[PDB]
Coordinates of C-alpha atoms and ligand atoms in Angstrom, one line a residue:
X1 CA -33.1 15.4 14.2
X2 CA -31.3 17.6 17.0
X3 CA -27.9 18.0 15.8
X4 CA -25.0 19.4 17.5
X5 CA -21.4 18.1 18.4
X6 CA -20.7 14.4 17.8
X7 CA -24.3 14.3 15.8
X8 CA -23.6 16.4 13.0
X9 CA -26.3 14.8 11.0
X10 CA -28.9 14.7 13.7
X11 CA -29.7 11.5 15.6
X12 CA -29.0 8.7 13.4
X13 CA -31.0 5.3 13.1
X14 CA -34.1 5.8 14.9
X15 CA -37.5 4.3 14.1
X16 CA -40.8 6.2 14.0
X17 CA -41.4 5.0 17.8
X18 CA -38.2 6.5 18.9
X19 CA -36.6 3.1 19.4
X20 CA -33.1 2.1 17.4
X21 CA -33.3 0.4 14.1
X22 CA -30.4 -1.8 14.9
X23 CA -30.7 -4.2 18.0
X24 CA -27.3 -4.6 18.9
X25 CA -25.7 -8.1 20.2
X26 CA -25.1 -8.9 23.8
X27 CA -21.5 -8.8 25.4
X28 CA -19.6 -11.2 23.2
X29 CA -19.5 -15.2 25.3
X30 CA -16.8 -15.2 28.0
X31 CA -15.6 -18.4 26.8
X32 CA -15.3 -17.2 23.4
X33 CA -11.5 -18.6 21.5
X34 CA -10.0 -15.2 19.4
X35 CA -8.4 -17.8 16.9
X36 CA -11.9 -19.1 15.9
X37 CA -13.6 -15.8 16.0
X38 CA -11.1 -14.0 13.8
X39 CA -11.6 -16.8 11.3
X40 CA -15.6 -16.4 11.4
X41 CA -15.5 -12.6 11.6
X42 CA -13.3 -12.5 8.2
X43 CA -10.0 -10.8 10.2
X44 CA -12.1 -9.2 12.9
X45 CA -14.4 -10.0 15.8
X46 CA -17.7 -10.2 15.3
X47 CA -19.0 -10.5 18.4
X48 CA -17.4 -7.3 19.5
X49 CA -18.1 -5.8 16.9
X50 CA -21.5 -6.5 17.3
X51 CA -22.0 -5.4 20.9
X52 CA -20.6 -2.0 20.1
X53 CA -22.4 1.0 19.4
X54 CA -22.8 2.3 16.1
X55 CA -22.4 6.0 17.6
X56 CA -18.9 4.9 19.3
X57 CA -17.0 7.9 20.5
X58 CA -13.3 8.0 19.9
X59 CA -10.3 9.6 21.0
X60 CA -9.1 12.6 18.8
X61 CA -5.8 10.9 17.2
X62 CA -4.5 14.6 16.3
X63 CA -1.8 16.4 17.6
X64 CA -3.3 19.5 19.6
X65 CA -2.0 22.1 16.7
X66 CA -4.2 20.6 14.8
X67 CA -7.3 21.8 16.5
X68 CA -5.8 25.5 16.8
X69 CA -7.2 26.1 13.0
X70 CA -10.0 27.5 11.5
X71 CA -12.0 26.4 8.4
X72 CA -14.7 28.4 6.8
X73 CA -17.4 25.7 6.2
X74 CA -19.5 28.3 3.7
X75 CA -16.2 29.1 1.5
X76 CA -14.9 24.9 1.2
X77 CA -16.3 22.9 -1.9
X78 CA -18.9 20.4 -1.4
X79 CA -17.4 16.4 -1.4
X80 CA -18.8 13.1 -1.7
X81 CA -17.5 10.3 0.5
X82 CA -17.7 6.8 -1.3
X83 CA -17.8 3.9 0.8
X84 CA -17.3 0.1 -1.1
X85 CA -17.7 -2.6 0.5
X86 CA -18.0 -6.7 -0.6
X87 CA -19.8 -8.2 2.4
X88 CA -18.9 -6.0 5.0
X89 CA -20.8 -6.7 7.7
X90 CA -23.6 -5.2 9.1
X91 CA -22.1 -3.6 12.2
X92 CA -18.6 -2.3 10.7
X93 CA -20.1 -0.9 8.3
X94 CA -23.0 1.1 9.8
X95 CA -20.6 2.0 12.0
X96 CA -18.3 3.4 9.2
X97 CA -21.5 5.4 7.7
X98 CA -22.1 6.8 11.4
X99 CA -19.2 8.2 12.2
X100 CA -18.4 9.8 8.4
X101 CA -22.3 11.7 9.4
X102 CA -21.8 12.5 12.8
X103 CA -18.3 13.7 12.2
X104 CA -18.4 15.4 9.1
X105 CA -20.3 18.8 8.9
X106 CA -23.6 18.7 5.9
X107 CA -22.3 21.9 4.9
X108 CA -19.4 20.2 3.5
X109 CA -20.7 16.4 3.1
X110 CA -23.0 16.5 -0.9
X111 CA -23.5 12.9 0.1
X112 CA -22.3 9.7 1.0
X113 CA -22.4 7.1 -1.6
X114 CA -22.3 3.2 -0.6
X115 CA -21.4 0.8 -3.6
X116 CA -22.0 -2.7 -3.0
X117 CA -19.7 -4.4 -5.2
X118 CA -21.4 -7.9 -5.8
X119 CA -22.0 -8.6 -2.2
X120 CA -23.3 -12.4 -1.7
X121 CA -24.2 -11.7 2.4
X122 CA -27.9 -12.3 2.8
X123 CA -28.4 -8.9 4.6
X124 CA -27.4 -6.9 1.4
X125 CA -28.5 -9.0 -1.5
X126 CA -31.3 -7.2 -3.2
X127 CA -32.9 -10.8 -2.8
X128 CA -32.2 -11.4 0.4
X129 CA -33.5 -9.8 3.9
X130 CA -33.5 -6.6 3.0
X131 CA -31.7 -5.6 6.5
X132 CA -29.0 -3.0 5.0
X133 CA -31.8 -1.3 2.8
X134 CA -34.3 -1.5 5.5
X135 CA -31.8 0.4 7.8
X136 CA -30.7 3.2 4.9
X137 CA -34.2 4.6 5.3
X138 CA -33.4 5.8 8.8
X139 CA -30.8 7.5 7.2
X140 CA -30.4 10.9 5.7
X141 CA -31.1 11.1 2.5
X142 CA -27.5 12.0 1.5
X143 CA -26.6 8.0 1.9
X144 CA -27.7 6.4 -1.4
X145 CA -26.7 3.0 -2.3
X146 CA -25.6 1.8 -5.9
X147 CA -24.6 -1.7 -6.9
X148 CA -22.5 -3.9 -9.2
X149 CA -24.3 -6.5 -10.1
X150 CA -20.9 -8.7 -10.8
X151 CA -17.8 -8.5 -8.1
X152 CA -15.7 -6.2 -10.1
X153 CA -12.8 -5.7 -7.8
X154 CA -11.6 -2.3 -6.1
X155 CA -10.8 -0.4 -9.3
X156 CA -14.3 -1.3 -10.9
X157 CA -16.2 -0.4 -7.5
X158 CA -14.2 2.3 -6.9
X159 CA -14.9 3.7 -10.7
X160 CA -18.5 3.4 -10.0
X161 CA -19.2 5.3 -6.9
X162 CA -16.7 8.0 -8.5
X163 CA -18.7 8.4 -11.2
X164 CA -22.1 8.2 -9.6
X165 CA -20.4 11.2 -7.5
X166 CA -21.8 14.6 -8.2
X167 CA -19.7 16.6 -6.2
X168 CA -16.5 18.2 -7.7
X169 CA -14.0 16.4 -4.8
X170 CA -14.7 12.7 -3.6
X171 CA -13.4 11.2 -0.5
X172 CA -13.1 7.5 -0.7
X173 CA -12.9 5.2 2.4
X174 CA -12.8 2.0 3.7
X175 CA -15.7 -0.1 5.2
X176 CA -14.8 -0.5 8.1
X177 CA -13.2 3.1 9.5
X178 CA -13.7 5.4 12.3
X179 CA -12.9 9.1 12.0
X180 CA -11.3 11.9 13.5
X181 CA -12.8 14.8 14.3
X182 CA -12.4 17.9 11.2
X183 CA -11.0 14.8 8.9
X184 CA -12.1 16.2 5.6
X185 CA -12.0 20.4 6.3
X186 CA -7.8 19.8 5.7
X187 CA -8.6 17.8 2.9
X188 CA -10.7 20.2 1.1
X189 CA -9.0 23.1 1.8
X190 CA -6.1 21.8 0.5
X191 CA -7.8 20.4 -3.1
X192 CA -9.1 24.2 -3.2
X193 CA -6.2 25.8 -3.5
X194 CA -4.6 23.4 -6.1
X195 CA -7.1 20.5 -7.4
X196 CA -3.8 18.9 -8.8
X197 CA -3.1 18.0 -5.2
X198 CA -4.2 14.1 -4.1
X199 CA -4.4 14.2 -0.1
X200 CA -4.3 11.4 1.9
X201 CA -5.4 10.9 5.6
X202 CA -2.9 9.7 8.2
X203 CA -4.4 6.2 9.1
X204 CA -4.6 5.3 12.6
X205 CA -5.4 1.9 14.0
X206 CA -8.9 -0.1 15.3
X207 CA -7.3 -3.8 16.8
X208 CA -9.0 -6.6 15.4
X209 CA -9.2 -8.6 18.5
X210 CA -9.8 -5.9 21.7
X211 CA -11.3 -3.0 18.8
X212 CA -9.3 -0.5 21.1
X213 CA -8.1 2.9 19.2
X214 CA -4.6 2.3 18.3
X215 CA -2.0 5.5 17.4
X216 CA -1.0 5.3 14.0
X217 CA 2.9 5.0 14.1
X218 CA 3.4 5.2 10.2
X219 CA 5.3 8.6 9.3
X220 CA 4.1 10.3 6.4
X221 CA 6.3 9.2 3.2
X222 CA 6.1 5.9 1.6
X223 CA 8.3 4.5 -0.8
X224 CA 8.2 1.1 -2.6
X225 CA 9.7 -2.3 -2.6
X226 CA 10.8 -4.0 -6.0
X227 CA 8.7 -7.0 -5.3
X228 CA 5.9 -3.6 -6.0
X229 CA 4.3 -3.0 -2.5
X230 CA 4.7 0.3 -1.0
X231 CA 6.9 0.6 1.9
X232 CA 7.7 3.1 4.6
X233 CA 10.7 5.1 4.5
X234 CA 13.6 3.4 6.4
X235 CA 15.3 5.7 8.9
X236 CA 18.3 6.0 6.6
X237 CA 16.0 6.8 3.9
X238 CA 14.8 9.7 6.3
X239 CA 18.3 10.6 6.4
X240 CA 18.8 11.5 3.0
X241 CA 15.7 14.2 2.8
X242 CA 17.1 18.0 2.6
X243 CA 17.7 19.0 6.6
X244 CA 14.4 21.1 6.7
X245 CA 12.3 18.0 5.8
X246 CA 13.5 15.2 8.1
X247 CA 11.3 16.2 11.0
X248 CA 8.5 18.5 9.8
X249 CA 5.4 20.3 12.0
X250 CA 2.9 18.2 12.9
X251 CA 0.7 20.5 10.8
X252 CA 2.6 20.8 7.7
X253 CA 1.4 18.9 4.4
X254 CA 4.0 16.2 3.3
X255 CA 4.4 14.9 -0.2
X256 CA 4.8 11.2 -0.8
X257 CA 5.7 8.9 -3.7
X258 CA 3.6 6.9 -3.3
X259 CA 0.4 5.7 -1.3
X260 CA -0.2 3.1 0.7
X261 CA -4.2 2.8 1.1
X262 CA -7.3 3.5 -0.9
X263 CA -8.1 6.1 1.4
X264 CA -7.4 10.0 -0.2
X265 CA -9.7 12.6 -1.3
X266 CA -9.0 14.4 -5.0
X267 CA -10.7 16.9 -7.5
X268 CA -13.0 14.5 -9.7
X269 CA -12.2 16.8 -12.4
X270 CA -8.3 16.3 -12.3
X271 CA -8.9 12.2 -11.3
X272 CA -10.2 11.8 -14.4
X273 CA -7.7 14.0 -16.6
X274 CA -4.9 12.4 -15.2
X275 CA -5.8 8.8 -15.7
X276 CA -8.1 7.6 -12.9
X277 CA -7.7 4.2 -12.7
X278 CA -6.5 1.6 -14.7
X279 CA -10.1 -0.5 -15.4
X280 CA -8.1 -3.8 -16.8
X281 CA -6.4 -4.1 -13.0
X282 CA -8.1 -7.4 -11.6
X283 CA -9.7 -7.4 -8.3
X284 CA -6.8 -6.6 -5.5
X285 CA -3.8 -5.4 -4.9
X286 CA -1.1 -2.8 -6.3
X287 CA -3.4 -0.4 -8.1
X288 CA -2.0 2.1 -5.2
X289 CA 1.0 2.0 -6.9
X290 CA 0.2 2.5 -10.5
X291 CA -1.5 5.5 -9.6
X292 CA 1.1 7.2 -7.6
X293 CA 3.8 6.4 -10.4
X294 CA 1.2 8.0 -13.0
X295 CA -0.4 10.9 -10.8
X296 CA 3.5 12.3 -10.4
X297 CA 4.3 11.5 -13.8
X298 CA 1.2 13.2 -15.1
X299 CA 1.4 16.3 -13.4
X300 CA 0.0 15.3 -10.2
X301 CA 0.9 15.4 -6.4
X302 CA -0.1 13.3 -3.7
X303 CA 0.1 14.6 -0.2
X304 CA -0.1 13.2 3.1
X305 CA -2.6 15.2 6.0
X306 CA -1.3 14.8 9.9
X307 CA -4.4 16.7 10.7
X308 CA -6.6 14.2 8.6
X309 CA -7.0 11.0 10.8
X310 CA -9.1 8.0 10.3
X311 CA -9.1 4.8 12.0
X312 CA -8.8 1.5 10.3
X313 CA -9.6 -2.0 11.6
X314 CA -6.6 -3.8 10.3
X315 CA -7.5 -7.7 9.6
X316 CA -5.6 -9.9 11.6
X317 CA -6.1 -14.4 11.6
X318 CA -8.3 -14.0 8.3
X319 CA -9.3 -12.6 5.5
X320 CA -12.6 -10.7 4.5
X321 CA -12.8 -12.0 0.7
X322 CA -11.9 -13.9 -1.9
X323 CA -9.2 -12.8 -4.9
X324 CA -7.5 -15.1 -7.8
X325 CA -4.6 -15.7 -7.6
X326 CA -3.2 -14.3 -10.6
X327 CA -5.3 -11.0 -10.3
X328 CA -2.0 -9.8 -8.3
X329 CA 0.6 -10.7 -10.3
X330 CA -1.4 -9.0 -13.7
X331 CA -2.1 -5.8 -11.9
X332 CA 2.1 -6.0 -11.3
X333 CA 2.3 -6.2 -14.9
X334 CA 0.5 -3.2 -16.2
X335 CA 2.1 -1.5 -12.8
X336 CA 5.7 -2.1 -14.9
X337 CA 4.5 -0.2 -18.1
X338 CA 5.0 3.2 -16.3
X339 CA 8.7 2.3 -15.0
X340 CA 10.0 2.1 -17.7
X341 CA 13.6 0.6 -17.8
X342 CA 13.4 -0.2 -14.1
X343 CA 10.7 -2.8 -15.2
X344 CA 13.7 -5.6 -15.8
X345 CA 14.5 -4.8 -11.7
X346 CA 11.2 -5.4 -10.8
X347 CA 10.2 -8.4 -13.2
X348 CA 13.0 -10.3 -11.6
X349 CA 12.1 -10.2 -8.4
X350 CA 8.7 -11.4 -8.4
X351 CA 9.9 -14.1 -10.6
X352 CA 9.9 -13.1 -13.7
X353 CA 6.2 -13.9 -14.1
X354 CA 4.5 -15.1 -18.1
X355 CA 0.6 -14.0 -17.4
X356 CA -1.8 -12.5 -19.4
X357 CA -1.6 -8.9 -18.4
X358 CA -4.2 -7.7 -21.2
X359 CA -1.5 -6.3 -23.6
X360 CA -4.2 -5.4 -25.8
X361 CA -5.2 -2.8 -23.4
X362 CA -1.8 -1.9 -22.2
X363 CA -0.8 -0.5 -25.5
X364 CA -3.9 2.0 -25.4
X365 CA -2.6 3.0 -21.7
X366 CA 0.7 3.5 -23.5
X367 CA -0.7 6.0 -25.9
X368 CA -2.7 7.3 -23.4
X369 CA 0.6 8.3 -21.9
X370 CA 2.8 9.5 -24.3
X371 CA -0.4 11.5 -25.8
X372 CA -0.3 13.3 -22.3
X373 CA 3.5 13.6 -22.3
X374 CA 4.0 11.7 -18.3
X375 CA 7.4 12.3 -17.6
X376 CA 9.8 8.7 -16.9
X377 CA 10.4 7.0 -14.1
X378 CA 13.6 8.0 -13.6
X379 CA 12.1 11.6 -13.7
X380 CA 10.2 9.8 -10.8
X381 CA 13.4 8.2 -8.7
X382 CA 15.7 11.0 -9.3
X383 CA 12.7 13.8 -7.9
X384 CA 10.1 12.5 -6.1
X385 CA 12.1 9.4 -4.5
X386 CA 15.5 10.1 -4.7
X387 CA 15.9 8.8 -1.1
X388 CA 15.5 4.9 -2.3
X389 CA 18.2 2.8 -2.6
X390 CA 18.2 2.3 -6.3
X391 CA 17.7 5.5 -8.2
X392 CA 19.7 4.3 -11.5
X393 CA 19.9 0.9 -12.4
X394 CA 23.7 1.8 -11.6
X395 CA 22.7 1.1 -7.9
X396 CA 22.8 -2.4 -8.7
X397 CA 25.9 -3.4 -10.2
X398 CA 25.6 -7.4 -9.9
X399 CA 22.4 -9.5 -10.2
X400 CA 23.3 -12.7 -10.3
X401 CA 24.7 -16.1 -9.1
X402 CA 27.5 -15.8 -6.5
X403 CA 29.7 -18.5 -7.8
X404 CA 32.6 -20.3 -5.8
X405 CA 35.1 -21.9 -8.6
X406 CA 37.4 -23.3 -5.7
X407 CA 34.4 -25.7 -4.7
X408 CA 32.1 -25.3 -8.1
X409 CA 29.2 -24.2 -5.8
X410 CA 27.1 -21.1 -5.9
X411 CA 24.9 -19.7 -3.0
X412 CA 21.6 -21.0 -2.7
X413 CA 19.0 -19.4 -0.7
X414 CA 17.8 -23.5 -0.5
X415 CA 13.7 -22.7 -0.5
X416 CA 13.1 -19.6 1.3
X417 CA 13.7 -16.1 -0.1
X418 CA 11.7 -15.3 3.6
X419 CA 14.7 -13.8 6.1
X420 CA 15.7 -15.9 8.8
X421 CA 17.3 -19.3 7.4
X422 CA 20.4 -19.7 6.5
X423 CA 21.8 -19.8 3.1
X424 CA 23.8 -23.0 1.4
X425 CA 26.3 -24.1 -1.0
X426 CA 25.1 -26.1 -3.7
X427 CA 25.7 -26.8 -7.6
X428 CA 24.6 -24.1 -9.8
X429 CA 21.7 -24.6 -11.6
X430 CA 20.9 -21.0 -12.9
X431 CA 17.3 -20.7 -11.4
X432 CA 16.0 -17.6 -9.8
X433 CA 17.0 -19.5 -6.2
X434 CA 20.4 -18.6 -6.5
X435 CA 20.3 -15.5 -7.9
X436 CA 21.4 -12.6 -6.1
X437 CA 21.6 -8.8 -6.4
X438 CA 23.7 -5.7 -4.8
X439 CA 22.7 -2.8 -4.1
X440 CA 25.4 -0.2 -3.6
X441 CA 24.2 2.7 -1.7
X442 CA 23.5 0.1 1.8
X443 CA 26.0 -2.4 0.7
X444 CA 23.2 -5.3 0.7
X445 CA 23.6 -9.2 -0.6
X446 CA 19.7 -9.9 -1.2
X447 CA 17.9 -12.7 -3.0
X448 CA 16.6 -11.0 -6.3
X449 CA 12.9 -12.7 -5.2
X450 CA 13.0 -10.6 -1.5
X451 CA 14.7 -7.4 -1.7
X452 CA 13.6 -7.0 2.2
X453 CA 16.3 -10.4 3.1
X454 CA 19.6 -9.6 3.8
X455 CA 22.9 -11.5 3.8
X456 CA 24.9 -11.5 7.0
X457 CA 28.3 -12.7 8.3
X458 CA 26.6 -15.7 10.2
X459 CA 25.2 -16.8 6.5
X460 CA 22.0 -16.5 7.3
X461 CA 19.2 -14.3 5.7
X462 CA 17.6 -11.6 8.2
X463 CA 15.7 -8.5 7.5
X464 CA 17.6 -5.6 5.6
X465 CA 18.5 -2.9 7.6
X466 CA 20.2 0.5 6.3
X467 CA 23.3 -0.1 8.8
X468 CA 26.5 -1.3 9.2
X469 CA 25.2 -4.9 10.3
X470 CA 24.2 -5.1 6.6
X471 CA 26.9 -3.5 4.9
X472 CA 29.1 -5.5 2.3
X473 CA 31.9 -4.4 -0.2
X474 CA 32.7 -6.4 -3.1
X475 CA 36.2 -6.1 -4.2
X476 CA 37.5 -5.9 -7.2
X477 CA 39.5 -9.7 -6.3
X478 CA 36.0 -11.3 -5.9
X479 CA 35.6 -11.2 -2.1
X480 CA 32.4 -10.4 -0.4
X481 CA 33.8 -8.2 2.9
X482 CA 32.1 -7.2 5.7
X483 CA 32.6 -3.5 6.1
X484 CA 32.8 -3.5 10.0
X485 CA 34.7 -6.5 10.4
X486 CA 36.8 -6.2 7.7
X487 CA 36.5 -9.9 7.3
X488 CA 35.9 -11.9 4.2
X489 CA 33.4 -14.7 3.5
X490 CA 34.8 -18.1 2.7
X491 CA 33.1 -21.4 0.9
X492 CA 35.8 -23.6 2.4
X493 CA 34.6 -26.9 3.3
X494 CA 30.8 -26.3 2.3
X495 CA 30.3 -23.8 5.1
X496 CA 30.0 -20.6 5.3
X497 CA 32.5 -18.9 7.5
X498 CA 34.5 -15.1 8.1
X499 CA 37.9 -15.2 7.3
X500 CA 40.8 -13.5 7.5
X501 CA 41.2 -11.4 3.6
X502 CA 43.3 -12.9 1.5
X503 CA 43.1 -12.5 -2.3
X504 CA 45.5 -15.8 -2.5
X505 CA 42.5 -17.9 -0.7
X506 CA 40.6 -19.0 -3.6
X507 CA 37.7 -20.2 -1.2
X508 CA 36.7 -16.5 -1.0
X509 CA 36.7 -15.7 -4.2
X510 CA 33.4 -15.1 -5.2
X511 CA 32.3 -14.6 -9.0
X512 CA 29.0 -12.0 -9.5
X513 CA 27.4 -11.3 -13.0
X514 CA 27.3 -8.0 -13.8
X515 CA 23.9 -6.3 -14.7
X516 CA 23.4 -4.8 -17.5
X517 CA 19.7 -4.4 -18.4
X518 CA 18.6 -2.4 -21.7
X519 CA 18.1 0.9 -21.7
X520 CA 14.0 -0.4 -22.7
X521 CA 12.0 -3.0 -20.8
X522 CA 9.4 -4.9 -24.0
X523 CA 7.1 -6.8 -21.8
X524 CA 7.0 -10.7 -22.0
X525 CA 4.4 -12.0 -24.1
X526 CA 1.5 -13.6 -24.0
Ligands
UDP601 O1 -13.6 -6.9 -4.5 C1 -13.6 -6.1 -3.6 C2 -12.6 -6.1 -2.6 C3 -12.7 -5.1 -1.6 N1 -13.7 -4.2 -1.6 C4 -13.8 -3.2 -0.5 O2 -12.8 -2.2 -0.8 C5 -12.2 -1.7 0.5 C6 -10.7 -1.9 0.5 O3 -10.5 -3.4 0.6 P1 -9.6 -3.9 1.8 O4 -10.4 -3.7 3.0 O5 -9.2 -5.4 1.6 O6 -8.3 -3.1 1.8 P2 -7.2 -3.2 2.9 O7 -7.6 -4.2 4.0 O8 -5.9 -3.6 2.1 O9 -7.1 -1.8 3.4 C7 -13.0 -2.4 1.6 O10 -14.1 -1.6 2.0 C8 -13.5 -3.7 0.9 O11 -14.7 -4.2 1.5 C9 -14.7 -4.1 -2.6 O12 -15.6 -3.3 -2.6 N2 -14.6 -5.1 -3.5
MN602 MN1 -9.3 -1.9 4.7
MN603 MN1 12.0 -1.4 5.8

């Protein structure tokens, strides 16, 4: 096999006549439109893609400290990487499966487990060509390949390479990744000393387009929008952190609350004592969420590793697969069962949604955590993310229509809860369109459906920003001020101008409801 650095598995993909098992494509067509190629290649170009080597060489992503450590390959446990993938191609992928082998030491590596979660391509079905299979036994024998018969989603192809997993901690990546070099020793290390740990590797960047390395920028903490996605921390988020924590060593292990990707490595053991996944969530989107609020409830902690890199091709002008529609809003749902009364926030703003969630199944996940004892989520906001904007539901005094009585009009965000349009005067009509929402600790005037839209002076919406171009007070006369101008908004003649204060001016006195949500969110049902 003749192993050795940048081969740690040996020469990978060669036939018994010493040739490669993978005839790779020609440089892609010099006339070739990116538009139209993204949209065949599923987010990413093919014909790159295809002209690249399997055994591409990348630039270490880590910060030098990094490589001044030591690892004991004979004393770490034993992990499995699993790798799902629906229709992935051919090239990504391999080229995800060689650099996990060449990079990762078979000390450390029990296997490497590929889960084709219903694919349709003809180069995986078990009907079809036979191409993917065909390759795998050029492969060590580590790589074994499991499938769903059915498209079950992330959490259900995710489940199933974890389970098929022998080793006590499992790695999962993506399908189309390129690592670091040492990208699981930090990992494992770090799951030895205390399997209640969940690390994460710092994600860097493969362009879509050009497929040139790109440094991941993201810091290390994540927080999460009300609309439930997870969000980086703002810089004035950052500021609030305890001094010693604002700017930490490139080195050092950094808790988050939540995570972003499916990408972390965790003792299977603990996984499954403190919940695994939820197996009712529907195909995509916002399990990453459910399982941070319930790993930190539950007793867990997720970490972030600087020294653990991993490129990812990010998708750009398409997508790779399908996903129902509704599938996002239901896995938002059950998401809500572990915030307890800080569901109300959140099913506001994504618009106060009536779907079948499975609340038969919900109610067993509810015993399943009070039969654990998972601490609430304001535990959650007032420990792990104390930096966000809203840790009571005190943060947000008002949600609401802002109400004009001078001109009977109330603001109206007229279509577009999106930033960058501006914001009208119209009758009330009490839909979610003119509802709006304060949050006291940045002083922001939001639409309740896009807590990321800010009211400004101009009356427009832009991007929210934890600064003083944001910042509004709302006095105790009504008026909506400006904190650096010290100007106050006005409805007078339809428009939307600054004014000079004046609690006599009836045109700026603004009306808010107050909010006050129960002290226990019961789901909508069914
Ligand atoms: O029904 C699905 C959807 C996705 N995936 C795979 O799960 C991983 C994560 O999906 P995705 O790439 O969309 O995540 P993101 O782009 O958000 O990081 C990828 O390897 C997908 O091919 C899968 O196995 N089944
Ligand atoms: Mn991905
Ligand atoms: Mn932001």
């Amino acid at each position: 096999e003749g192993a050795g650095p940048g081969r740690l598995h040996g020469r990978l993909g060669i036939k018994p006549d010493g040739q490669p098992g993978y005839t790779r494509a020609p440089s892609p067509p010099t006339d070739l439109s990116m538009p139209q190629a993204l949209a065949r290649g599923g987010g990413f170009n093919l014909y790159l893609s295809d002209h690249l080597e399997l055994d591409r060489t990348a630039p270490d992503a880590r910060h030098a400290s990094c490589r001044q450590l030591h690892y004991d390959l004979s004393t770490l446990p034993k992990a499995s990487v699993i790798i799902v993938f629906y229709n992935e191609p051919f090239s990504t992928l391999m080229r995800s499966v060689h650099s996990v082998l060449n990079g990762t030491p078979p000390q450390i590596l029990e296997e490497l487990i590929l889960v084709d979660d219903g694919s349709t391509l003809p180069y995986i079905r078990e009907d079809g060509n036979q191409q993917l299979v065909e390759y795998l036994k050029l492969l060590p024998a580590k790589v074994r390949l499991i499938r769903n018969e059915v498209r079950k989603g992330i959490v259900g192809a995710r489940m199933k390479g974890i389970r098929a997993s022998r080793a006590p901690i499992f790695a999962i990546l993506d399908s189309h990744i390129e690592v670091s070099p040492q990208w699981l020793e930090p990992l494992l290390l770090r799951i030895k000393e205390d399997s209640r740990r969940v690390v994460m590797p710092q994600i860097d960047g493969i362009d879509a387009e050009t497929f040139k390395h790109i440094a991941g920028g993201i810091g290390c903490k994540l927080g999460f929008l009300w609309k439930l996605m997870e969000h980086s921390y703002e810089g004035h988020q950052t500021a609030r952190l305890p001094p010693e924590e604002r700017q930490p060593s490139p080195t050092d292990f950094q808790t988050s609350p939540a995570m972003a990707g499916g990408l972390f490595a965790a003792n299977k053991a603990f996984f499954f004592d403190v919940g695994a996944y939820d197996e009712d969530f529907q195909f995509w989107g916002t399990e990453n969420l459910e399982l941070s609020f319930r790993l930190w409830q539950c007793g867990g902690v997720l970490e972030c590793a600087p020294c653990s890199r991993v490129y990812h091709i990010f998708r750009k002008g398409g997508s790779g697969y399908s996903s129902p529609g509704d599938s996002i809003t239901i896995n938002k749902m059950r998401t809500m069962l572990w915030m307890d009364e800080y569901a109300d926030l959140a099913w506001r703003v994504i618009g106060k949604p009536r779907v079948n969630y499975r609340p038969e199944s919900l109610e067993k996940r509810r015993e399943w955590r009070k039969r654990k004892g998972c601490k609430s989520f304001r535990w959650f906001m007032e420990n792990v993310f104390p930096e966000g904007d809203v840790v009571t539901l005190d943060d947000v005094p008002y949600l609401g229509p802002l109400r004009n009585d001078k001109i009977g009009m109330c603001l109206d965000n007229m279509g577009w809860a999106s930033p960058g349009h501006a914001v009208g005067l119209e009758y009330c009509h009490g839909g979610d369109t003119q509802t709006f929402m304060f949050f006291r600790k940045v002083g922001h005037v939001m639409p309740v459906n896009d807590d990321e839209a800010c009211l400004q002076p101009s009356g427009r919406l832009d991007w929210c920003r934890g600064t003083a171009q944001f910042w509004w007070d709302f006095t105790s006369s009504g008026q909506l001020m400006f904190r650096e101008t010290k100007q106050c908004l006005s409805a007078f003649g339809r428009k939307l101008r600054m004014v000079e204060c004046d609690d006599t001016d009836p045109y700026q006195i603004w009306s808010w409801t107050a909010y006050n949500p129960p002290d226990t969110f019961t789901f909508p049902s069914v």
